[PDB]
Amino acid sequence: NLPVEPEFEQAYKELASTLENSTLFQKNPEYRKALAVVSVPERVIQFRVVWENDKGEVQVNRGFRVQFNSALGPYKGGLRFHPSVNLSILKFLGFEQIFKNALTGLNMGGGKGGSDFDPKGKSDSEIRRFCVAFMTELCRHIGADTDVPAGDIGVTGREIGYLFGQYRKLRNSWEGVLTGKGGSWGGSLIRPEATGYGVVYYVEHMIAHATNGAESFAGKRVAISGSGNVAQYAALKVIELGGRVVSLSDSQGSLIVKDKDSFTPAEIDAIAALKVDRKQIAELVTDAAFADKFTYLPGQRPWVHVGAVDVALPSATQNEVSGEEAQALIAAGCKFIAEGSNMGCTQAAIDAFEAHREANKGAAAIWYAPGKAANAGGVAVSGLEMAQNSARLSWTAEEVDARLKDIMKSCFQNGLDTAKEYATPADGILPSLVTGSNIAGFTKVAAAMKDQGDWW
Amino acid sequence: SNLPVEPEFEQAYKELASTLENSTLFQKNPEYRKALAVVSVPERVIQFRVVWENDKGEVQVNRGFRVQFNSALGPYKGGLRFHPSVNLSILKFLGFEQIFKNALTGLNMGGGKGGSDFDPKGKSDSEIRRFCVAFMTELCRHIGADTDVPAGDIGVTGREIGYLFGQYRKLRNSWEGVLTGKGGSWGGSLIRPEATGYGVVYYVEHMIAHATNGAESFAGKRVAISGSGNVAQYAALKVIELGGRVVSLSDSQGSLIVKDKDSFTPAEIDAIAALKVDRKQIAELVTDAAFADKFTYLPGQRPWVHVGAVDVALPSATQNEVSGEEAQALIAAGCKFIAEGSNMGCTQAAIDAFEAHREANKGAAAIWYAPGKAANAGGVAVSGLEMAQNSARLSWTAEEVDARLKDIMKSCFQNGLDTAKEYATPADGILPSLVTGSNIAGFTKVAAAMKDQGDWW
Amino acid sequence: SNLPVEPEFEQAYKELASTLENSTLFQKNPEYRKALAVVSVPERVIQFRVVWENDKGEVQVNRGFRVQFNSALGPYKGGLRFHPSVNLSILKFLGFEQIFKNALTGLNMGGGKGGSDFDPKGKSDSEIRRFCVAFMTELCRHIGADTDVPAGDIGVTGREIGYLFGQYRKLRNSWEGVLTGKGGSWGGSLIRPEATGYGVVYYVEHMIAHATNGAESFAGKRVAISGSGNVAQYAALKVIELGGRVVSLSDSQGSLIVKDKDSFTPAEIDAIAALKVDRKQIAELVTDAAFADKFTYLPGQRPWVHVGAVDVALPSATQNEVSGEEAQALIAAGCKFIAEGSNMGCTQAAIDAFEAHREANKGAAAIWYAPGKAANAGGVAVSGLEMAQNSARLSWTAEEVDARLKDIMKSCFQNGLDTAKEYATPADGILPSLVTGSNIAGFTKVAAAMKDQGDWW
Amino acid sequence: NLPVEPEFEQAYKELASTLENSTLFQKNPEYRKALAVVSVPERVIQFRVVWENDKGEVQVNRGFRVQFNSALGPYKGGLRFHPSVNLSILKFLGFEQIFKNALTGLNMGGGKGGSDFDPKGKSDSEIRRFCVAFMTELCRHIGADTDVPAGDIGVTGREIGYLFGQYRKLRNSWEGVLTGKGGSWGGSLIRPEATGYGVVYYVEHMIAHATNGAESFAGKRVAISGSGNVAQYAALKVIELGGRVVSLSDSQGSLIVKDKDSFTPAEIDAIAALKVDRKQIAELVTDAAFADKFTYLPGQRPWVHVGAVDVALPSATQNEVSGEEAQALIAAGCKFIAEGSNMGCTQAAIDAFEAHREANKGAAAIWYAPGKAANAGGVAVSGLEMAQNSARLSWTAEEVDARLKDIMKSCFQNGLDTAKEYATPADGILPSLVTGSNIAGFTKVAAAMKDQGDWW
Ligand SMILES: [Cl-]
Ligand SMILES: [Cl-]
Ligand SMILES: [Cl-]
Ligand SMILES: [Cl-]
Ligand SMILES: [Cl-]
Ligand SMILES: [Cl-]
Ligand SMILES: [Cl-]
Ligand SMILES: [Cl-]
Ligand SMILES: [Cl-]
Ligand SMILES: [Cl-]
């Protein structure tokens, strides 16, 4: 009867496996009933989006908003404008957001939405007239206390603007219906730098536990990819804490440090200029002495081309770390990897690290954290943008970063201590932050659902 | 390319595109291609998780769906189906068709459909009750007298519509025509039971009037019905009221034919109703002496050829119950009017045979075939009037309802006729195609209205 | 003192006060002065910024307005006008008048009006479409089937009402009678095109009945119409159906008079319709031979004096199309019944001439003049029935609509009659004043209802 | 077509002029399109108000609510009950509130409303029955997240009470729909003293910049007018900071210090008693030694009768500073003027100071700040009353005054730095806080409107 939705089903069974591979259904058997119920969305909306192009021709796309789980809070998720998009994909991405959001500790449920509207080629007026056509239907199904959408692939500050304007004008209300907002109309500070800072802050704890405090980020070689605000802020934060950033990348190839020890803020700051007004990471080299410092390898990704590294922060795309690149890293002395990008690491890679972890005792293991724990920094700040809107206040950068810091420490700890309860490791084995985190998001959500009578 | 495969849906998008292309529409009206682009993606679809409890007290989980396909000509109008086959694909199939089927009536009704993969089979009334309750609590917010008026279908009959109506009213705190298929004393219409069958008869009546330029009635006419349920029963009765001879009925394992030069009497029909209730068969009548004569039972048979000289044929039992052979017998028996009470009762062969003879015989010497999409639209017509009555705050008399049912069936007929005359303009003297006419007319009415209202330009 | 100057509005507050004072109302009913105080300030006015995009992709900015003037007798009822002259002053003028005009009908309709200084001139359909869309997105929240039902007017016709209806439905997610002037297949009423002209005829019919104590019809009656558009056309047709002789039509540069002892035939009328479409003139008929005889063209002329011996006069072309001279010709030609299809078609001179002859000739020997405020109220009557039909969930037949139109025109007539008999009580034998009667009756009905409901005490 | 609305049109063109007289439409030409769009209200409501007098007779007034701009927040504005009132005036006052509110930095749009209902003569029961009749229509168009009205001429704590009661009873909701509320039902501390404190705090910064820190309020002669909570708190705050308050006034004439140096808190405190239970500033003199200290001049205003002053704080009425009084002040050595009252200073006066500023270099100039920046203190606190309601908390006086202090510093700076960008002055000329502030409110609002797609 039920359709085939491979990417969603993939993630259901890969979650389920981890709960079986634990003691959770022995202390708590009745939770199997919950997994039946969490896995079918509370509500899904699919609606037609008719809009006009600059030539004046009728166009039509599909809109979707998966409203998956609201046991811990209003639906929270993102809008993706990409021609790949469908329900299957949006339930997959939605399904994750539940547990991710739950690991924040803030009261936010999980959903996702978007369109197969393809930004590429389209003018700003086209985008503006699509965002308007989209939210005209969506508007009725969402709200400050019901569902707070956000940005994702295809939709940015630009689109969030147009979305929020049309909502405001339909609803006749100024409310925190969308996160990712501009400074002047309910944005939060630390939003651009949230996910990056959040990954670095998470790993700080990884290092501490693994090394019993013997090691920080200071004097560590950390491999980053990507040159958006994620890779940028991640890098900066590594520098502040006394660490050395060896690598950055763009879609056309990567830049590796090999004359001097690390990128300098200004070298990072100059790749930021290379991102605004188009331009490319490559441009940087061939210029003010950057020729000597840096090696450019077009077409490639840094994982192998970095030498002996300690920390790896994929901050570019999905599936940007394969089983080879994980084995490269292991062999390269890497001991710590989390994602700044969403699902940057492939299953193959996770499997390799999690095997390496089981087989190597103490600090000798490579430790991988999942996205649902390590790259929560941005959804956390979405949470605090919500909190600010409601307060009717803009907090200082100190305020937000402080709360982000407490939120990421508590995340790490929750995965650690859970894994130590349910996936209890062997003498001197590092507990699973994959299983630990998986269990922790399932159990917080599943419990609240029981409390509220969604299952019995 | 990214789109899910929905075989039922696109097996019908295609079917319609085929018709429209082949017609002369996209040549007078190229730009209506833009309408088929946009009509064919639902205005809104809702799917929602459905948690209900069984008699053992266990969490159960099914999926609920409400496809809200078109609202150009009126509120979403559709049905709920509870069957474990159900998914979006199927309900966008059914929903797409309800648009153009509803439109034919002439009433202000959009097109939609919904339901669950809840399986009524072997559930107790408590379980059904607890599921209808659990299901309407989410649906409630998306439907209404002026937004969406659902109804019954597979798995969803009077019992279920009651339980849906009760929960809606409870939650919304309002008493409105939010469902059709309701009880007598809480907003139902009379002629609901009799709606589809009287509809079929009323369609043919119009057919006869046109073809015979108003020089013939049903009066006298010898009518071959097949089936022995809602549709066959009331159809027969309507033929009798109008001075017609109902000459045949039919079952699964067996058929019934009259003594010749005669018809069934309402009581003999009323006796076939008692036979289906108590799950018995039609032979059971010929068992009794008073009908042992007056009727012949032929096991394993379909009446088309056993009847003799016949004028009207109303297949009303199952699909594919008329072969190309049986079509020819009818033609040669002098049959001139054949409409479906059943959906796709006639096979493509049969259709081509009638439509061939239509194209090669002029005027009312032709046999005329009408599709179920139109000839069977009484139920939906009365839904419409059940709506109208609930708003009027009134129960019309049986006569009032039947009379309005009759007028809605002319509107169906006429819509097809006119359309075929425009976009499949026949040779001089030849009856227009009501298959084609009726397959096109819903679209044109809807597409035009969507232009009028600016859903495409 | 602080109040803005709104010349159109207070040029009409004054006009009404004048009438009411001069009548005997504020002497039987002193306290109704308090009603004129409160009726004369709108219950609610909305004005809202209107940003829309043109075909070059540029921000455009106009002002939208919805004056919601009175709801004592029913939902706000009015029209949208898109004309660059438009402001609040004008729309409170038009809105104030709709109150008392609507009231005359006897139906439950309040009074309001809205629109923009958007100029339709030289805008493409996309631009209109994009403006209707932008405009209804703010309006949407303030209107509804039971709150405010807008319609068309200058700059706002069937095309625009479609685009408004589409956007409303889209936003509100409801299908209701939120506009009148709709398509045939999405909730329009038949007799909308024919509403005003049939209305004018139906008014006079009542006039004749009264004056001749039911001893005369339209049958035979020689009728002088002026104009050649919606109103003149359908008016003529209705006179013909009722056994009347339509003896004249008229244009901008020229008029048409019959051969004497004769009338126009529906086909000759149907041919004047083809002439206005394709922007041609009435002479163009006398060009053709079959009408070259049977009709005389007099360029630059108005029929009033060229017609001969006439009974009924229906000015239906422009304002101020009847002088005090032309009034006297009519009187001396034995004309006994004259109503306006056009607004202020008769000049004050003309009115005084009819009303003078009324006051100085007893009974149906008098010529009787009815104002457009009443005689032309068919369009608004059918709006009313378009509403009623949408709620009924039904399309009545043409006959049904026309019959109800006829009953609403008696209610208009009677309301004026009775009022004049009460508050401008005529000398014995003299026909009451339907100018005065019809200028008063809206107020009294509304003012009383507002007392009943406690908007004043 | 469009009607004539002189007071609104006056303010449109006087704003526009300042933007032309800048470099803004050269760096940002497309902003001319914004000024077209901001200038026509988003929504306006005019509704009949039928109410009964104590004699039992039907009465009727007009109600209005101009909801001008909501790009930065819910509509925020005030209700004025005055028989002068109409749309023109309410669009004028509304139009200002947009930019004023925007200069606060908090998320508040701009509107205004009220009636030609004349309080004067009317009993408390009449007022009560008018406020009730008014809000019965208004109620539907406003709300905690849509439009939050306030007090103005004609409407005070008294009326705000009656308004809030009828709202509550219609809406069945306790929410921050109105500011200016009583202590026990969602008022804020520092509300009475907000605008006064806000003007003084703003000037503190003026003095600092102009004198490079060489001078505070300490030992400065400051001329105030008015004796309501604005002039009172302004004065007190000057005293705390070590300044000398030379003048106060009422509608019947002013009181000038000339025996001793300054008013003492208790002399201020005693004029507060002269305001409750009616009474007059005059009363004070002729009594406990006040005869000697103070000179009373009935019929007059202090601007000329103060001697040599340093700071001027009009805190009484509109248009209470003419071109003569500005020339008096200049000649009297005044170097710093802002309004505690709404539009206290006339155009003539602004023109005179702004000329004097252009012609006199450095500290030698008189510096005028506009109301849209200097007297924001009250609308700021309206903002924080909103914030408190939402928090579900009453902050301490310290809390609110602290935030007010940060809000007024950031205002000043925003006008300074803007003016230095777009109205860049000549060597040693003090930048324009008129133009600086004008530009700053237009650009924050105009930008957010672009972000949200109100223009393109
Ligand atoms: Cl599944
Ligand atoms: Cl909804
Ligand atoms: Cl982010
Ligand atoms: Cl159905
Ligand atoms: Cl009948
Ligand atoms: Cl109208
Ligand atoms: Cl009639
Ligand atoms: Cl203007
Ligand atoms: Cl509203
Ligand atoms: Cl204040």
DSSP string, C243-293: T-EEEEEE-SS-EEEE-SS----HHHHHHHHHHHGGG--SHHHHHSHHHHS
Sequence-distant (6+) residues with CB within 8 A of D402 are: none
For the record, the structure tokens of B447 come out as 């597409």
Q: Could you count the other beta carbons within 10 Å of the beta carbon of residue D411?
A: 28
Q: Which amino acid would we find at residue D9?
A: E
Cα Rg, chain B, nearest whole Å: 22
For the record, the structure tokens of B383 come out as 């839904």
Cβ proximity of B362 and B430 under 8 Å: yes
CA gap B44, C171 in Å, rounded: 12
* Whole-number Cα distances in Å, B59 to A32, A40, A394, A441, C65: 12, 14, 45, 22, 55
Q: Could you count the other beta carbons within 10 Å of the beta carbon of residue B46?
A: 22
Secondary structure class of D63 (helix, strand, coil)? strand
Residue D41 with chain C: CB contacts under 8 Å: 47-49
Tokens 């219609």 locate to D170
CA gap A316, A150 in Å, rounded: 19
Q: Which helix (H) or strand (E) holds D66?
A: strand D58-69
Sequence-distant (6+) residues with CB within 8 A of D135 are: D162, D163, D166, D167, D170
Query: Of C94, C85, C90, which Cα lies nearest the Cα of C112?
Result: C94
Q: Which amino acid would we find at residue B263?
A: S
For the record, the structure tokens of C392 come out as 């009924």
CA gap D187, D164 in Å, rounded: 12
Query: Of C409, C363, C430, which Cα lies nearest the Cα of C104?
Result: C409
Residue B13 with chain A: CB contacts under 8 Å: none
Query: Which DSSP string do the residues of C19-42 spell out, in sequence order?
Result: HHHHTTHHHH-GGGHHHHHHHTS-
Cβ proximity of D324 and D354 under 8 Å: no
CA gap A316, A321 in Å, rounded: 10
Cβ proximity of C302 and C326 under 8 Å: yes
Cβ proximity of A442 and A448 under 8 Å: no
List the single best residue of A38, A60, A89 to mutate versus B (max B Cβ within 10 A): A60
* Whole-number Cα distances in Å, D168 to B23, D143, D172: 63, 11, 5
For the record, the structure tokens of C29 come out as 């009913």
Q: Could you count the other beta carbons within 10 Å of the beta carbon of residue C442?
A: 27
Q: Could you count the other beta carbons within 10 Å of the beta carbon of residue B72?
A: 29
CA gap A339, A377 in Å, rounded: 11
Active site (annotated) includes residue C113:
yes
B155 is in an annotated binding site: yes
Residue of C nearest to A132 (CA): C134
For the record, the structure tokens of D349 come out as 């006066």
Cβ proximity of D99 and D442 under 8 Å: yes
Cβ proximity of A265 and A218 under 8 Å: no
Name the DSSP class of B141.
Answer: G
Half-sphere exposure (Cβ direction) of C217: Cα atoms closer than 13 Å: 10
Q: Which ligand is nearest to the CA of B398?
A: 5
Strands (E), A134-269: 147-148, 221-224, 244-250, 253-257
For the record, the structure tokens of D35 come out as 């000024």
CA gap B41, A61 in Å, rounded: 9
Q: Is D58 exposed, middle or buried (0-12, 13-18, 19+ CB in 10 A)?
A: middle
Reduced to 3 DSSP states, what percent helix, strand and coil does chain A have, rounded to the nearest 5?
A: 50, 15, 35
* Whole-number Cα distances in Å, C19 to C22, C30, C70, C432, C435: 5, 14, 20, 15, 10
Cβ proximity of A227 and A410 under 8 Å: no
Could you tell me the maximum CA-CA distance found in chain C, to the nearest angstrom? 70
CA gap B262, D365 in Å, rounded: 117
Tokens 């569902």 locate to A147
Query: Of A18, A66, A22, which Cα lies nearest the Cα of A43?
Result: A66
**Window B:369-428, CB contacts with C under 8 Å:** 384, 387-388, 391-392
Give distance in angstroms: CA of D164 to centre of ligand 10: 17
Provide the Cα torsion A99, A104, A110, A114; round to 10°: -110
Tokens 């006066």 locate to D349
Helices (H), ranges, B140-183: 158-172
Reduced to 3 DSSP states, what percent helix, strand and coil does chain D have, rounded to the nearest 5?
A: 50, 15, 35
Contact at CB, B147 and C187, closer than 8 angstroms: no
For the record, the structure tokens of A297 come out as 């390898």
Residue length of chain C = 457
* Whole-number Cα distances in Å, C386 to C189, C380, C430, D396: 5, 10, 38, 62
Q: Which amino acid would we find at residue C86?
A: V
Reduced to 3 DSSP states, what percent helix, strand and coil does chain C have, rounded to the nearest 5?
A: 50, 15, 35
A59 alpha carbon, distance to own chain's centre: 32
CA gap B26, B8 in Å, rounded: 25
For the record, the structure tokens of B389 come out as 């009555």
Tokens 């002065």 locate to C33
List the single best residue of C44, C91, C141, C154 to mutate versus D (max D Cβ within 10 A): C44
For chain A, the three-class secondary structure string (H helix, E strand, C coil) is CCCCCHHHHHHHHHHHHHHHCCCHHHHCHHHHHHHHHHCCCCEEEEEEEEEECCCCCEEEEEEEEEEEECCCCCEECCEEECCCCCHHHHHHHHHHHHHHHHHCCCCCCEEEEEECCCCCCCCHHHHHHHHHHHHHHHHHHCECCCEECCCECCECHHHHHHHHHHHHHHHCCCCCCCCCCCHHHCCCCCCCCHHHHHHHHHHHHHHHHHCCCCCCCCCCEEEECCCCHHHHHHHHHHHHCCCEEEEEEECCEEEEECCCCCCCHHHHHHHHHCCCCCCCHHHHCCCCCHHHHEEEEECCCCCCCCCCCCEEECCCCCCCECHHHHHHHHHCCCCEECCCCCCCECHHHHHHHHHHHHHCCHHHCCEECCHHHHCCHHHHHHHHHHHHHHHCCCCCHHHHHHHHHHHHHHHHHHHHHHHHHHCCCCCCCCCCHHHHHHHHHHHHHHHHHHHHCCCC
Secondary structure class of C70 (helix, strand, coil)? strand
* Å between A170 CA and nearest CA of chain C: 7
A342 is in an annotated binding site: yes
Query: Of D345, D357, D341, which Cα lies nearest the Cα of D423?
Result: D357
Of C38, C45, C63, the CB nearest to D60: C38
Secondary structure class of C64 (helix, strand, coil)? strand
Sequence-distant (6+) residues with CB within 8 A of C150 are: C66, C78, C79, C80, C112, C114, C139, C143, C164, C178, C179, C180
Angle at D275 between CA D273 and CA D281, to 5 degrees: 90
D315 alpha carbon, distance to own chain's centre: 9
For A13-48, the three-class secondary structure string (H helix, E strand, C coil) is HHHHHHHHCCCHHHHCHHHHHHHHHHCCCCEEEEEE
Cβ proximity of B200 and B338 under 8 Å: no
For the record, the structure tokens of B151 come out as 């109804």
* Whole-number Cα distances in Å, A428 to A21, A329, B195, C375, D422: 19, 22, 78, 99, 65
Could you tell me the maximum CA-CA distance found in chain D, to the nearest angstrom? 69
Q: Which amino acid would we find at residue C402?
A: D
Which residues on adjacent β-strands are paired with residue A79? Answer: A113
Sequence-distant (6+) residues with CB within 8 A of B309 are: B222, B333, B334
CA gap C190, C378 in Å, rounded: 12
CB-based burial, B346-367: b 16+ in 10 Å, e otherwise: bbebbbebbbebbeebeebebb
For the record, the structure tokens of A236 come out as 């900066």
Half-sphere exposure (Cβ direction) of B82: Cα atoms closer than 13 Å: 23
For the record, the structure tokens of B179 come out as 């469902």
Cβ proximity of A161 and A182 under 8 Å: yes
Residue B146 with chain C: CB contacts under 8 Å: 145, 174-176
For the record, the structure tokens of D172 come out as 């069945």
Cβ proximity of D39 and D11 under 8 Å: no
For the record, the structure tokens of B266 come out as 């309402």
CA gap B365, B211 in Å, rounded: 9
- Whole-angstrom distance between the N-terminal and C-terminal Cα of chain B? 25
User: By what technique were these coordinates determined?
Assistant: X-ray
Q: Which amino acid would we find at residue B195?
A: A
Secondary structure class of C327 (helix, strand, coil)? helix
CA gap C145, A385 in Å, rounded: 40
Query: Of B406, B399, B405, which Cα lies nearest the Cα of B384?
Result: B405
Query: Of D399, D77, D401, D387, which Cα lies nearest the Cα of A392?
Result: D387
CA gap D336, D313 in Å, rounded: 9
* Whole-number Cα distances in Å, D205 to B7, C6, D312, D369, D406: 73, 48, 15, 11, 12
Q: What is the arrangement of strands in the sheet containing C337-339, beginning at the earlier edge strand?
A: C295-298, C255-258, C245-250, C222-226, C312-315, C337-339, C368-370
Contact at CB, A47 and B43, closer than 8 angstroms: yes
Sequence-distant (6+) residues with CB within 8 A of C453 are: C72
Sequence-distant (6+) residues with CB within 8 A of B226 are: B232, B248, B249, B250, B255, B302, B303, B304, B314, B315, B316, B317, B321, B345
Contact at CB, B45 and A41, closer than 8 angstroms: no
Cβ proximity of D29 and C43 under 8 Å: no
* Å between A173 CA and nearest CA of chain C: 13
Name the DSSP class of C305.
Answer: G
Name the DSSP class of C426.
Answer: P
Helices (H), ranges, B319-397: 324-332, 348-360, 372-375, 378-392
* Whole-number Cα distances in Å, B41 to A269, B3, B100, D22: 47, 11, 14, 52
- Whole-angstrom distance between the N-terminal and C-terminal Cα of chain A? 25
Break sites following residues in chain A (C–N > 2.5 A): none
Query: Of B278, D246, B106, which Cα lies nearest the Cα of C396?
Result: B106
Residue C170 with chain A: CB contacts under 8 Å: 136
Sequence-distant (6+) residues with CB within 8 A of C336 are: C211, C311, C312, C364, C365, C366, C367, C368
Contact at CB, C61 and D40, closer than 8 angstroms: yes
CA gap A275, A279 in Å, rounded: 6
Query: Of C275, C271, C272, C247, which Cα lies nearest the Cα of C259?
Result: C247
Q: Which amino acid would we find at residue C444?
A: T
Contact at CB, D1 and C117, closer than 8 angstroms: yes
Q: Is C274 exposed, middle or buried (0-12, 13-18, 19+ CB in 10 A)?
A: exposed
Residue of C nearest to B177 (CA): C393
Provide the Cα torsion B332, B338, B342, B346; round to 10°: 40
Query: Of D200, D216, D199, which Cα lies nearest the Cα of D208?
Result: D216
Q: Which ligand is nearest to the CA of C191?
A: 7
DSSP-derived pairing of the beta strands D43-52 and C44-53: antiparallel
For the record, the structure tokens of A257 come out as 């440090």
Residue C141 with chain A: CB contacts under 8 Å: 172
